Amino acid sequence: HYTFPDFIEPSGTVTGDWVYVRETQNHYSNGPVTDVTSPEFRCYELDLQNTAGQTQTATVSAGDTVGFKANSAIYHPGYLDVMMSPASPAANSPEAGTGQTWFKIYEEKPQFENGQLVFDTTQQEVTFTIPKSLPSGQYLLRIEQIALHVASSYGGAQFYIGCAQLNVENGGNGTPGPLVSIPGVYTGYEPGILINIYNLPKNFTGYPAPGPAVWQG
Amino acid sequence: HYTFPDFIEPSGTVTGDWVYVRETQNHYSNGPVTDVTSPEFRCYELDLQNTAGQTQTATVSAGDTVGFKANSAIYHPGYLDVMMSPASPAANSPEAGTGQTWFKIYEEKPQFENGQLVFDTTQQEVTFTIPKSLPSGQYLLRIEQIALHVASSYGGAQFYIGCAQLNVENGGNGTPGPLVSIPGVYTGYEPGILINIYNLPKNFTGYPAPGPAVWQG
Ligand SMILES: *[C@H]1O[C@H](CO)[C@@H](O)[C@H](O)[C@@H]1O
Ligand SMILES: [Cu+2]
Ligand SMILES: [Cu+2]
């Protein structure tokens, strides 16, 4: 149970709560979204229609390292990913990211050792690189942790999400892919989402990361 | 989130919901006790004063195999124990087991190998032997699973509890010990209760079972 209220800007400053990140519904409860088919799986805003317009947009350069800071240690075992979408008409529009335009730029997978998965549950700041070749333009940047501590049953996986609003400058001519929709990216039946992390399947050879591969940009 | 509504009698019959097991407060929620100091940590009854009187008492013999069936798979990782107390004035008295009279008879313990804890989260029926040397008389039989999936913080451990009411016949001359009170047995600071199962401390040699040593009778 945690939120991602703070955008970490290119020079390493942790910005204010919900300044550049769309304030989420769980701003107080810290509870997860658990229905991957729901529209609110996209950015989980306090107000899906009003929150974007109350959120500022951060200017960055393609190639910059940026991040999020969680309100506590990211204490559930899971998979973490960061996905991006061009934001049309702009980063502060609620209609941004409603099409098949999302691509993955970063992930942190559990390790696999001795027939057991290995997790890091002590991280609070998550940082990563905005790809150098990413074209200039407005983008949504979505952090997602899939917490798997009770994921053995359908709808058991817990998703902790935040969407930052970006204005990306000094971009290249890359073509991000593969592309997915959110919701749409998951069914809930994926082997990395519906999973018993404590007693793994017989032919388990490593954590299968769900959704698109990381775009090499 | 599970309950232990069904007593498994000596012949292997899984008995009806709450017949010999005191109906618990989470009879619908399946939610856990989290305050080890609370009086209801004892048997977690729907009504601490009324439930015992509405619960039947199972006649068994010392040496018999008995147990509990949970209402689903016991799917959280943790530590399971079974404790007993002589029940005065009777097994159906709410006053039973209010003293320092509890002893451990059984456990299911997580394993430690290569720096990782190993759990079994697939069991639904828990069976065990009532020690052959146990003195004849009325007893409470308390099953407890300490779920550790979120136990890294104080009060994070989740306790799933059921108390069966027994009339033990054909007993022996054993003297059960060591003895504890419930509440009283735990403080919540035990290294087996206040614990990050995913990222274990430097000087961690193996899972330290909380509470008293198993009484081998
Ligand atoms: C703060 O530091 C960042 C990261 O090195 C730069 O991108 C930025 O121009 C400023 O100097
Ligand atoms: Cu949580
Ligand atoms: Cu539970």
Side-chain angles (χ1 to χ4, degrees), chain A residues 1-2 29-32 75-76 147 149 158 160, chain B residues 150:
Chain A
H1 286 54
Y2 26 85
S29 69
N30 296 180
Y75 67 86
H76 297 310
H149 58 298
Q158 293 174 3
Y160 299 96
Chain B
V150 291

Side-chain angles (χ1 to χ4, degrees), chain B residues 69-200:
Chain B
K69 188 184 184 174
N71 71 331
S72 70
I74 303 162
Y75 66 84
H76 297 310
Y79 170 76
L80 190 141
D81 61 271
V82 183
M83 295 189 272
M84 291 188 85
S85 173
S88 294
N92 76 339
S93 174
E95 279 182 350
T98 50
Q100 193 181 329
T101 57
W102 291 92
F103 54 94
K104 191 178 288 172
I105 65 155
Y106 181 71
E107 65 182 359
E108 291 175 17
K109 193 171 161 182
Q111 310 154 24
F112 183 72
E113 202 168 63
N114 298 305
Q116 266 229 250
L117 284 171
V118 187
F119 297 94
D120 184 1
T121 64
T122 66
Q123 198 193 26
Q124 183 177 4
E125 300 182 5
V126 185
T127 55
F128 44 83
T129 308
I130 302 301
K132 174 65 174 182
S133 74
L134 187 68
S136 293
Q138 301 270 301
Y139 288 89
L140 294 183
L141 182 63
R142 181 185 181 272
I143 189 167
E144 166 188 81
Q145 196 226 23
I146 312 173
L148 296 179
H149 56 299
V150 291
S152 61
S153 60
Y154 187 86
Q158 295 175 5
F159 299 79
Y160 300 93
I161 304 168
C163 288
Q165 294 177 178
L166 298 187
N167 172 44
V168 172
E169 289 176 347
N170 308 303
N173 72 327
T175 53
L179 303 169
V180 294
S181 294
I182 312 171
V185 58
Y186 312 135
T187 63
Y189 296 101
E190 290 77 11
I193 296 181
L194 180 53
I195 186 172
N196 190 334
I197 65 164
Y198 313 101
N199 299 115
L200 300 159

Side-chain angles (χ1 to χ4, degrees), chain A residues 9-12 64-65:
Chain A
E9 58 83 40
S11 301
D64 274 334
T65 55

